[PDB]
mmCIF file of C-alpha atoms and ligand atoms in Angstrom:
data_model
loop_
_atom_site.group_PDB
_atom_site.id
_atom_site.type_symbol
_atom_site.label_atom_id
_atom_site.label_comp_id
_atom_site.label_asym_id
_atom_site.label_seq_id
_atom_site.Cartn_x
_atom_site.Cartn_y
_atom_site.Cartn_z
ATOM 1 C CA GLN A 1 -28.371 -100.354 -26.106
ATOM 2 C CA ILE A 2 -24.677 -99.457 -26.100
ATOM 3 C CA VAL A 3 -23.024 -101.609 -23.440
ATOM 4 C CA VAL A 4 -20.321 -100.112 -21.225
ATOM 5 C CA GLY A 5 -18.434 -102.921 -19.497
ATOM 6 C CA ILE A 6 -16.583 -102.287 -16.252
ATOM 7 C CA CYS A 7 -13.695 -104.671 -15.647
ATOM 8 C CA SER A 8 -11.696 -104.312 -12.433
ATOM 9 C CA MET A 9 -11.239 -105.940 -9.019
ATOM 10 C CA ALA A 10 -14.345 -105.897 -6.796
ATOM 11 C CA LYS A 11 -12.659 -103.483 -4.316
ATOM 12 C CA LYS A 12 -12.600 -101.000 -7.203
ATOM 13 C CA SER A 13 -15.813 -101.893 -9.055
ATOM 14 C CA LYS A 14 -17.858 -101.676 -5.822
ATOM 15 C CA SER A 15 -16.080 -98.607 -4.359
ATOM 16 C CA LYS A 16 -18.310 -95.639 -3.500
ATOM 17 C CA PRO A 17 -16.786 -93.394 -6.222
ATOM 18 C CA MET A 18 -17.255 -96.135 -8.846
ATOM 19 C CA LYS A 19 -20.902 -96.646 -7.794
ATOM 20 C CA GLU A 20 -21.552 -92.892 -7.838
ATOM 21 C CA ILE A 21 -20.164 -92.578 -11.387
ATOM 22 C CA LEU A 22 -21.850 -95.750 -12.787
ATOM 23 C CA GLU A 23 -25.328 -94.808 -11.503
ATOM 24 C CA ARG A 24 -24.870 -91.514 -13.400
ATOM 25 C CA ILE A 25 -23.571 -93.090 -16.621
ATOM 26 C CA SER A 26 -26.650 -95.361 -16.422
ATOM 27 C CA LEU A 27 -28.857 -92.251 -16.770
ATOM 28 C CA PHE A 28 -27.793 -92.009 -20.424
ATOM 29 C CA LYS A 29 -30.847 -93.219 -22.381
ATOM 30 C CA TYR A 30 -28.900 -95.471 -24.771
ATOM 31 C CA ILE A 31 -26.242 -96.770 -22.374
ATOM 32 C CA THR A 32 -26.390 -99.886 -20.198
ATOM 33 C CA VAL A 33 -23.588 -100.551 -17.671
ATOM 34 C CA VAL A 34 -22.449 -104.126 -17.044
ATOM 35 C CA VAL A 35 -20.004 -104.643 -14.172
ATOM 36 C CA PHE A 36 -17.909 -107.811 -14.669
ATOM 37 C CA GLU A 37 -17.991 -109.963 -11.485
ATOM 38 C CA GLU A 38 -14.611 -110.509 -9.831
ATOM 39 C CA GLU A 39 -15.019 -114.314 -9.814
ATOM 40 C CA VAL A 40 -15.591 -114.166 -13.603
ATOM 41 C CA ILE A 41 -12.531 -111.933 -14.147
ATOM 42 C CA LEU A 42 -10.294 -114.280 -12.140
ATOM 43 C CA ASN A 43 -11.770 -117.736 -12.870
ATOM 44 C CA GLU A 44 -13.540 -117.641 -16.267
ATOM 45 C CA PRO A 45 -11.680 -117.642 -19.590
ATOM 46 C CA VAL A 46 -12.145 -114.345 -21.482
ATOM 47 C CA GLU A 47 -14.378 -116.112 -24.079
ATOM 48 C CA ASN A 48 -17.016 -116.315 -21.305
ATOM 49 C CA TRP A 49 -16.755 -112.674 -20.146
ATOM 50 C CA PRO A 50 -19.782 -110.394 -20.865
ATOM 51 C CA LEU A 51 -19.828 -108.581 -24.178
ATOM 52 C CA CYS A 52 -19.465 -104.810 -24.268
ATOM 53 C CA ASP A 53 -19.116 -102.083 -26.880
ATOM 54 C CA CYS A 54 -17.003 -99.828 -24.661
ATOM 55 C CA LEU A 55 -14.590 -101.182 -22.060
ATOM 56 C CA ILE A 56 -13.524 -99.330 -18.903
ATOM 57 C CA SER A 57 -10.884 -101.529 -17.310
ATOM 58 C CA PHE A 58 -7.840 -100.950 -15.124
ATOM 59 C CA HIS A 59 -5.214 -102.874 -13.193
ATOM 60 C CA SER A 60 -4.881 -102.885 -9.439
ATOM 61 C CA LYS A 61 -3.413 -105.420 -7.046
ATOM 62 C CA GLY A 62 -4.386 -108.941 -8.098
ATOM 63 C CA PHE A 63 -5.901 -107.912 -11.445
ATOM 64 C CA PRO A 64 -5.099 -110.212 -14.389
ATOM 65 C CA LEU A 65 -4.106 -107.551 -16.908
ATOM 66 C CA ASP A 66 -3.035 -110.262 -19.406
ATOM 67 C CA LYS A 67 -6.684 -111.445 -19.461
ATOM 68 C CA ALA A 68 -8.090 -107.920 -19.863
ATOM 69 C CA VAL A 69 -5.723 -107.413 -22.805
ATOM 70 C CA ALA A 70 -6.796 -110.739 -24.370
ATOM 71 C CA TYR A 71 -10.469 -109.881 -23.859
ATOM 72 C CA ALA A 72 -9.991 -106.517 -25.626
ATOM 73 C CA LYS A 73 -8.159 -108.210 -28.535
ATOM 74 C CA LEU A 74 -10.940 -110.824 -28.783
ATOM 75 C CA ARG A 75 -13.903 -108.418 -28.652
ATOM 76 C CA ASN A 76 -12.354 -105.154 -29.981
ATOM 77 C CA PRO A 77 -14.390 -102.771 -27.784
ATOM 78 C CA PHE A 78 -13.818 -99.019 -27.703
ATOM 79 C CA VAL A 79 -11.268 -98.813 -24.868
ATOM 80 C CA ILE A 80 -11.411 -95.789 -22.519
ATOM 81 C CA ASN A 81 -8.160 -96.499 -20.625
ATOM 82 C CA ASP A 82 -5.627 -98.293 -22.813
ATOM 83 C CA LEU A 83 -4.661 -101.650 -21.301
ATOM 84 C CA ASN A 84 -1.126 -102.238 -22.627
ATOM 85 C CA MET A 85 -0.048 -98.844 -21.233
ATOM 86 C CA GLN A 86 -1.029 -100.173 -17.785
ATOM 87 C CA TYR A 87 1.971 -102.509 -17.813
ATOM 88 C CA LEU A 88 4.172 -99.390 -18.299
ATOM 89 C CA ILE A 89 2.377 -97.407 -15.583
ATOM 90 C CA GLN A 90 3.526 -100.105 -13.128
ATOM 91 C CA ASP A 91 7.175 -99.223 -13.776
ATOM 92 C CA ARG A 92 8.428 -95.807 -12.619
ATOM 93 C CA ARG A 93 11.264 -95.923 -15.191
ATOM 94 C CA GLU A 94 8.747 -96.267 -18.043
ATOM 95 C CA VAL A 95 6.557 -93.502 -16.596
ATOM 96 C CA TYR A 96 9.439 -91.027 -16.383
ATOM 97 C CA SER A 97 10.614 -92.040 -19.894
ATOM 98 C CA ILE A 98 7.190 -91.136 -21.350
ATOM 99 C CA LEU A 99 7.056 -87.832 -19.431
ATOM 100 C CA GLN A 100 10.529 -86.865 -20.723
ATOM 101 C CA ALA A 101 9.481 -87.728 -24.312
ATOM 102 C CA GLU A 102 6.471 -85.418 -23.917
ATOM 103 C CA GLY A 103 8.561 -82.435 -22.853
ATOM 104 C CA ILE A 104 7.008 -82.576 -19.375
ATOM 105 C CA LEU A 105 8.999 -81.047 -16.520
ATOM 106 C CA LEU A 106 9.993 -83.610 -13.910
ATOM 107 C CA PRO A 107 12.591 -83.849 -11.133
ATOM 108 C CA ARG A 108 16.151 -84.476 -12.256
ATOM 109 C CA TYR A 109 16.518 -88.227 -11.819
ATOM 110 C CA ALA A 110 18.771 -91.254 -12.328
ATOM 111 C CA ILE A 111 17.879 -94.945 -12.442
ATOM 112 C CA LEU A 112 19.891 -97.402 -10.321
ATOM 113 C CA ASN A 113 19.349 -100.870 -11.739
ATOM 114 C CA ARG A 114 20.745 -103.413 -9.318
ATOM 115 C CA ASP A 115 21.445 -107.069 -10.205
ATOM 116 C CA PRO A 116 19.970 -109.080 -7.321
ATOM 117 C CA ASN A 117 22.748 -111.714 -7.684
ATOM 118 C CA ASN A 118 25.484 -109.048 -7.845
ATOM 119 C CA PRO A 119 24.049 -106.160 -5.749
ATOM 120 C CA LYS A 120 27.348 -104.344 -5.004
ATOM 121 C CA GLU A 121 28.263 -104.174 -8.709
ATOM 122 C CA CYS A 122 25.693 -101.489 -9.648
ATOM 123 C CA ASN A 123 26.674 -97.858 -10.447
ATOM 124 C CA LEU A 124 26.298 -96.415 -6.922
ATOM 125 C CA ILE A 125 28.768 -94.395 -4.845
ATOM 126 C CA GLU A 126 27.610 -93.078 -1.484
ATOM 127 C CA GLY A 127 28.794 -90.121 0.578
ATOM 128 C CA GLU A 128 27.485 -89.074 3.985
ATOM 129 C CA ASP A 129 25.539 -86.199 2.275
ATOM 130 C CA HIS A 130 25.124 -87.395 -1.334
ATOM 131 C CA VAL A 131 24.862 -90.314 -3.713
ATOM 132 C CA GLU A 132 26.297 -90.718 -7.197
ATOM 133 C CA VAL A 133 24.142 -92.797 -9.524
ATOM 134 C CA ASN A 134 25.607 -93.669 -12.942
ATOM 135 C CA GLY A 135 27.990 -90.818 -12.177
ATOM 136 C CA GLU A 136 25.277 -88.272 -11.461
ATOM 137 C CA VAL A 137 25.484 -86.477 -8.123
ATOM 138 C CA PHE A 138 22.420 -86.005 -5.945
ATOM 139 C CA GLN A 139 23.139 -83.905 -2.881
ATOM 140 C CA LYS A 140 20.761 -84.442 0.043
ATOM 141 C CA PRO A 141 17.885 -83.873 0.263
ATOM 142 C CA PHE A 142 17.032 -86.456 -2.427
ATOM 143 C CA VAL A 143 14.237 -88.998 -3.032
ATOM 144 C CA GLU A 144 14.548 -92.759 -3.459
ATOM 145 C CA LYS A 145 11.659 -94.559 -5.185
ATOM 146 C CA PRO A 146 11.338 -98.309 -5.830
ATOM 147 C CA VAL A 147 11.256 -98.925 -9.576
ATOM 148 C CA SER A 148 7.882 -100.619 -9.071
ATOM 149 C CA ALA A 149 5.220 -97.889 -9.085
ATOM 150 C CA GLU A 150 3.116 -100.208 -6.910
ATOM 151 C CA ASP A 151 5.720 -100.170 -4.128
ATOM 152 C CA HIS A 152 4.938 -97.063 -2.058
ATOM 153 C CA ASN A 153 8.012 -97.305 0.193
ATOM 154 C CA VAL A 154 9.506 -94.046 -1.038
ATOM 155 C CA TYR A 155 12.338 -92.652 1.106
ATOM 156 C CA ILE A 156 13.577 -89.100 1.499
ATOM 157 C CA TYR A 157 17.134 -88.550 2.803
ATOM 158 C CA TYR A 158 17.842 -85.413 4.860
ATOM 159 C CA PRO A 159 21.137 -83.515 4.639
ATOM 160 C CA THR A 160 23.562 -83.461 7.597
ATOM 161 C CA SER A 161 22.682 -79.746 8.012
ATOM 162 C CA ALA A 162 19.144 -80.822 8.901
ATOM 163 C CA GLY A 163 20.146 -83.653 11.241
ATOM 164 C CA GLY A 164 20.424 -86.461 8.701
ATOM 165 C CA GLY A 165 18.311 -89.601 8.793
ATOM 166 C CA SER A 166 15.420 -90.218 6.443
ATOM 167 C CA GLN A 167 11.654 -90.079 6.004
ATOM 168 C CA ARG A 168 10.111 -93.444 5.093
ATOM 169 C CA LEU A 169 6.800 -93.044 3.248
ATOM 170 C CA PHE A 170 4.235 -95.815 2.871
ATOM 171 C CA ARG A 171 0.657 -96.497 1.864
ATOM 172 C CA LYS A 172 -1.344 -94.537 4.458
ATOM 173 C CA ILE A 173 -1.820 -96.618 7.662
ATOM 174 C CA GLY A 174 -4.696 -94.831 9.419
ATOM 175 C CA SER A 175 -3.196 -91.741 11.005
ATOM 176 C CA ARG A 176 0.207 -91.885 9.257
ATOM 177 C CA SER A 177 1.744 -91.673 5.792
ATOM 178 C CA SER A 178 5.438 -91.563 6.798
ATOM 179 C CA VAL A 179 7.852 -91.942 9.697
ATOM 180 C CA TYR A 180 11.301 -90.535 10.467
ATOM 181 C CA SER A 181 14.152 -92.993 10.647
ATOM 182 C CA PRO A 182 17.633 -92.305 12.001
ATOM 183 C CA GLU A 183 19.044 -94.299 9.043
ATOM 184 C CA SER A 184 21.081 -92.001 6.778
ATOM 185 C CA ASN A 185 22.385 -94.514 4.218
ATOM 186 C CA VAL A 186 20.379 -95.608 1.184
ATOM 187 C CA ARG A 187 18.797 -99.037 0.691
ATOM 188 C CA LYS A 188 21.266 -101.659 -0.533
ATOM 189 C CA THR A 189 18.925 -104.170 -2.177
ATOM 190 C CA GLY A 190 16.385 -103.471 -4.964
ATOM 191 C CA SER A 191 16.424 -101.120 -7.962
ATOM 192 C CA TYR A 192 15.563 -97.464 -7.446
ATOM 193 C CA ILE A 193 15.018 -94.133 -9.038
ATOM 194 C CA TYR A 194 16.912 -91.341 -7.290
ATOM 195 C CA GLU A 195 15.586 -87.840 -7.786
ATOM 196 C CA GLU A 196 16.249 -84.279 -6.739
ATOM 197 C CA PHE A 197 13.995 -83.091 -3.934
ATOM 198 C CA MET A 198 11.642 -80.376 -5.195
ATOM 199 C CA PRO A 199 10.873 -77.716 -2.549
ATOM 200 C CA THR A 200 7.117 -77.068 -2.316
ATOM 201 C CA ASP A 201 4.931 -75.268 0.208
ATOM 202 C CA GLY A 202 4.573 -78.716 1.853
ATOM 203 C CA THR A 203 1.600 -79.834 -0.250
ATOM 204 C CA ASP A 204 1.147 -82.068 -3.320
ATOM 205 C CA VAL A 205 -1.211 -81.166 -6.166
ATOM 206 C CA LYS A 206 -3.332 -84.202 -7.091
ATOM 207 C CA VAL A 207 -4.747 -84.031 -10.593
ATOM 208 C CA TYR A 208 -7.574 -86.207 -11.942
ATOM 209 C CA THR A 209 -8.335 -86.148 -15.676
ATOM 210 C CA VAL A 210 -11.493 -87.189 -17.484
ATOM 211 C CA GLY A 211 -10.256 -86.954 -21.029
ATOM 212 C CA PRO A 212 -7.557 -84.435 -21.967
ATOM 213 C CA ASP A 213 -9.768 -81.329 -21.574
ATOM 214 C CA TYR A 214 -11.030 -81.891 -18.045
ATOM 215 C CA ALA A 215 -8.929 -82.094 -14.929
ATOM 216 C CA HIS A 216 -9.945 -81.684 -11.341
ATOM 217 C CA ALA A 217 -7.116 -80.762 -8.976
ATOM 218 C CA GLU A 218 -6.850 -80.567 -5.185
ATOM 219 C CA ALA A 219 -3.967 -80.396 -2.717
ATOM 220 C CA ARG A 220 -2.993 -82.518 0.307
ATOM 221 C CA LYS A 221 -0.261 -82.296 2.913
ATOM 222 C CA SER A 222 2.902 -83.927 1.615
ATOM 223 C CA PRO A 223 3.737 -87.230 3.341
ATOM 224 C CA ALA A 224 7.342 -86.018 2.891
ATOM 225 C CA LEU A 225 6.733 -83.709 5.880
ATOM 226 C CA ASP A 226 6.210 -85.248 9.345
ATOM 227 C CA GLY A 227 3.814 -87.975 8.207
ATOM 228 C CA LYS A 228 0.791 -87.262 10.417
ATOM 229 C CA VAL A 229 -2.372 -87.378 8.286
ATOM 230 C CA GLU A 230 -4.572 -84.268 8.651
ATOM 231 C CA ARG A 231 -8.195 -85.306 9.201
ATOM 232 C CA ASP A 232 -11.395 -83.254 9.525
ATOM 233 C CA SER A 233 -14.299 -83.735 11.977
ATOM 234 C CA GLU A 234 -15.962 -86.334 9.733
ATOM 235 C CA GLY A 235 -12.681 -88.296 9.693
ATOM 236 C CA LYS A 236 -11.669 -87.766 6.039
ATOM 237 C CA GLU A 237 -8.243 -86.479 5.003
ATOM 238 C CA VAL A 238 -8.025 -82.687 4.624
ATOM 239 C CA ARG A 239 -7.913 -81.476 1.000
ATOM 240 C CA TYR A 240 -7.106 -77.925 -0.186
ATOM 241 C CA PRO A 241 -8.665 -76.197 -3.216
ATOM 242 C CA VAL A 242 -6.558 -75.921 -6.374
ATOM 243 C CA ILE A 243 -7.111 -74.304 -9.763
ATOM 244 C CA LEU A 244 -4.641 -75.449 -12.382
ATOM 245 C CA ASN A 245 -2.839 -72.699 -14.318
ATOM 246 C CA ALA A 246 -2.491 -72.758 -18.135
ATOM 247 C CA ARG A 247 0.807 -74.677 -18.004
ATOM 248 C CA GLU A 248 -0.687 -77.325 -15.714
ATOM 249 C CA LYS A 249 -3.826 -77.778 -17.840
ATOM 250 C CA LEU A 250 -1.464 -78.491 -20.720
ATOM 251 C CA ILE A 251 0.433 -80.998 -18.537
ATOM 252 C CA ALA A 252 -2.898 -82.723 -17.805
ATOM 253 C CA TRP A 253 -3.720 -82.799 -21.538
ATOM 254 C CA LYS A 254 -0.318 -84.364 -22.334
ATOM 255 C CA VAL A 255 -0.420 -86.948 -19.503
ATOM 256 C CA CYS A 256 -3.917 -88.141 -20.373
ATOM 257 C CA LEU A 257 -3.044 -88.562 -24.076
ATOM 258 C CA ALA A 258 0.541 -89.845 -23.670
ATOM 259 C CA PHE A 259 -0.499 -92.627 -21.340
ATOM 260 C CA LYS A 260 -3.755 -93.134 -23.251
ATOM 261 C CA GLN A 261 -5.669 -93.076 -19.958
ATOM 262 C CA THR A 262 -8.916 -91.122 -20.294
ATOM 263 C CA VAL A 263 -9.357 -91.296 -16.530
ATOM 264 C CA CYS A 264 -5.892 -90.568 -15.098
ATOM 265 C CA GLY A 265 -4.476 -89.538 -11.743
ATOM 266 C CA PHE A 266 -1.091 -87.814 -11.447
ATOM 267 C CA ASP A 267 0.784 -85.688 -8.909
ATOM 268 C CA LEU A 268 2.334 -82.214 -9.387
ATOM 269 C CA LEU A 269 4.974 -80.524 -7.286
ATOM 270 C CA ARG A 270 4.663 -76.758 -7.453
ATOM 271 C CA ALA A 271 8.297 -75.763 -6.999
ATOM 272 C CA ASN A 272 10.536 -72.887 -8.101
ATOM 273 C CA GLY A 273 7.766 -71.222 -10.159
ATOM 274 C CA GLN A 274 7.073 -74.329 -12.227
ATOM 275 C CA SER A 275 5.075 -77.555 -11.808
ATOM 276 C CA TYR A 276 6.786 -80.942 -11.912
ATOM 277 C CA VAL A 277 5.125 -84.341 -12.426
ATOM 278 C CA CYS A 278 6.487 -86.828 -9.899
ATOM 279 C CA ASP A 279 4.005 -89.705 -10.271
ATOM 280 C CA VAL A 280 1.435 -90.980 -12.764
ATOM 281 C CA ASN A 281 -1.118 -93.366 -11.251
ATOM 282 C CA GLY A 282 -3.466 -94.128 -14.146
ATOM 283 C CA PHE A 283 -7.144 -94.792 -13.425
ATOM 284 C CA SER A 284 -8.280 -92.763 -10.438
ATOM 285 C CA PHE A 285 -11.505 -91.066 -9.345
ATOM 286 C CA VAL A 286 -11.902 -88.067 -7.046
ATOM 287 C CA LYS A 287 -13.779 -88.889 -3.799
ATOM 288 C CA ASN A 288 -16.397 -86.800 -1.940
ATOM 289 C CA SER A 289 -17.104 -84.349 -4.751
ATOM 290 C CA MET A 290 -20.636 -84.444 -6.062
ATOM 291 C CA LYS A 291 -19.638 -82.057 -8.888
ATOM 292 C CA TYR A 292 -16.811 -84.391 -9.925
ATOM 293 C CA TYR A 293 -19.180 -87.382 -9.978
ATOM 294 C CA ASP A 294 -21.581 -85.384 -12.143
ATOM 295 C CA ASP A 295 -18.896 -84.078 -14.490
ATOM 296 C CA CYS A 296 -17.006 -87.351 -14.803
ATOM 297 C CA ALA A 297 -20.102 -89.395 -15.647
ATOM 298 C CA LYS A 298 -21.335 -86.788 -18.161
ATOM 299 C CA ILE A 299 -17.940 -86.683 -19.876
ATOM 300 C CA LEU A 300 -17.566 -90.489 -20.042
ATOM 301 C CA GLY A 301 -21.132 -90.901 -21.329
ATOM 302 C CA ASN A 302 -20.563 -88.185 -23.948
ATOM 303 C CA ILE A 303 -17.323 -89.868 -25.030
ATOM 304 C CA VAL A 304 -19.177 -93.183 -25.427
ATOM 305 C CA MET A 305 -22.057 -91.551 -27.361
ATOM 306 C CA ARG A 306 -19.751 -89.515 -29.629
ATOM 307 C CA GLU A 307 -17.751 -92.601 -30.561
ATOM 308 C CA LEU A 308 -20.493 -95.202 -30.916
ATOM 309 C CA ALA A 309 -23.808 -93.491 -31.735
ATOM 310 C CA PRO A 310 -23.072 -93.522 -35.515
ATOM 311 C CA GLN A 311 -22.658 -97.322 -35.773
ATOM 312 C CA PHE A 312 -25.724 -97.767 -33.555
ATOM 313 C CA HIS A 313 -27.696 -95.260 -35.687
ATOM 314 C CA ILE A 314 -28.497 -93.193 -32.596
ATOM 315 C CA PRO A 315 -29.029 -89.456 -33.145
ATOM 316 C CA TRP A 316 -26.178 -87.503 -31.548
ATOM 317 C CA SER A 317 -24.992 -83.930 -31.933
HETATM 318 N N1 ANP B 401 11.182 -85.347 -6.280
HETATM 319 C C1 ANP B 401 10.409 -85.045 -5.222
HETATM 320 N N2 ANP B 401 10.580 -83.892 -4.548
HETATM 321 C C2 ANP B 401 9.826 -83.605 -3.489
HETATM 322 N N3 ANP B 401 8.874 -84.437 -3.058
HETATM 323 C C3 ANP B 401 8.667 -85.608 -3.699
HETATM 324 C C4 ANP B 401 9.437 -85.938 -4.804
HETATM 325 N N4 ANP B 401 9.057 -87.136 -5.276
HETATM 326 C C5 ANP B 401 7.904 -87.580 -4.528
HETATM 327 N N5 ANP B 401 7.807 -86.577 -3.477
HETATM 328 C C6 ANP B 401 6.859 -86.658 -2.342
HETATM 329 O O1 ANP B 401 6.636 -88.011 -2.005
HETATM 330 C C7 ANP B 401 5.239 -88.322 -2.199
HETATM 331 C C8 ANP B 401 5.145 -89.740 -2.771
HETATM 332 O O2 ANP B 401 5.875 -89.903 -4.030
HETATM 333 P P1 ANP B 401 5.174 -90.530 -5.292
HETATM 334 O O3 ANP B 401 6.117 -90.527 -6.431
HETATM 335 O O4 ANP B 401 3.847 -89.932 -5.451
HETATM 336 O O5 ANP B 401 4.976 -92.039 -4.690
HETATM 337 P P2 ANP B 401 3.767 -93.118 -4.893
HETATM 338 O O6 ANP B 401 4.272 -94.244 -4.069
HETATM 339 O O7 ANP B 401 3.610 -93.363 -6.347
HETATM 340 N N6 ANP B 401 2.435 -92.465 -4.197
HETATM 341 P P3 ANP B 401 0.893 -92.671 -4.807
HETATM 342 O O8 ANP B 401 0.393 -91.221 -5.282
HETATM 343 O O9 ANP B 401 -0.014 -93.179 -3.717
HETATM 344 O O10 ANP B 401 0.903 -93.663 -6.043
HETATM 345 C C9 ANP B 401 4.765 -87.316 -3.245
HETATM 346 O O11 ANP B 401 3.343 -87.149 -3.182
HETATM 347 C C10 ANP B 401 5.505 -86.076 -2.787
HETATM 348 O O12 ANP B 401 4.882 -85.487 -1.642
HETATM 349 MG MG1 MG B 402 -29.132 -96.086 -19.442
HETATM 350 MG MG1 MG B 403 1.854 -90.035 -5.751
HETATM 351 MG MG1 MG B 404 2.035 -93.402 -7.593
#
């Protein structure tokens, strides 16, 4: 049997979408799935981790990515989502740098790197209705993102003409994804990316790749609007159907390959007749879609079989 090893925190490895996909990959005649226990990931040296031929592994909070990297170097499995790229995915500066290099449209942006021992010495000038970062002017509305992609405290600053203040976004707390604040001035500690605010119809397009030639997309209310989460009768967040256009399918192809993440989530802002990438999240599954579960498992299994059947002498067309 070809062994597909799953290496992530238990919250992820035991999530419903993970279980739905793994039960389906297990239906492949020549594939066995082995899910690495969290206690092993955290407490055992990599030399003791289960063997696999193909490794599906991804960082989330508390995950020892250094160990996953060392395991992959030690065992040389076929890696579905590249591990070293997952250090870069944690840094919004590195994400935007890769997107730029790939000719991918993204919001006009500037990086404010602030020295925590000399915080007033960074390249920031502030007006009541704009900031100037490294000399570049961003008129309000503009967006302020922590350089850490794991920090979801993204702020939007409203122009005086709209009443000023700001919208403070955060990891969804039950019924809310943002709150209005009267504060009009930008944060004065930390490093940030400042970006132009892209006007959309008030929704985000969420894209989920499984290899570069498959991408499921759906839309959700932007947390940049009022911040009240829309929920249906079953209690799940409202999603809107999306079909990606030719340009966006190419964006998906580029993102997947550029970040070397077979399974890759990213966000699009449909603004001014184009689509702009504002976020790349790496490993991410769609929830509550039986067709996605089917498709994703089939694609991943086929990828595994295509790559490894020859060395295993398994017939595969
Ligand atoms: N430049 C922009 N213009 C307009 N809206 C933006 C812009 N940047 C981000 N937003 C909005 O703010 C939301 C959050 O920003 P995003 O860069 O996705 O942060 P995040 O913290 O990485 N969120 P997550 O998808 O959970 O990882 C986006 O989904 C958009 O609705
Ligand atoms: Mg099987
Ligand atoms: Mg996002
Ligand atoms: Mg993100």
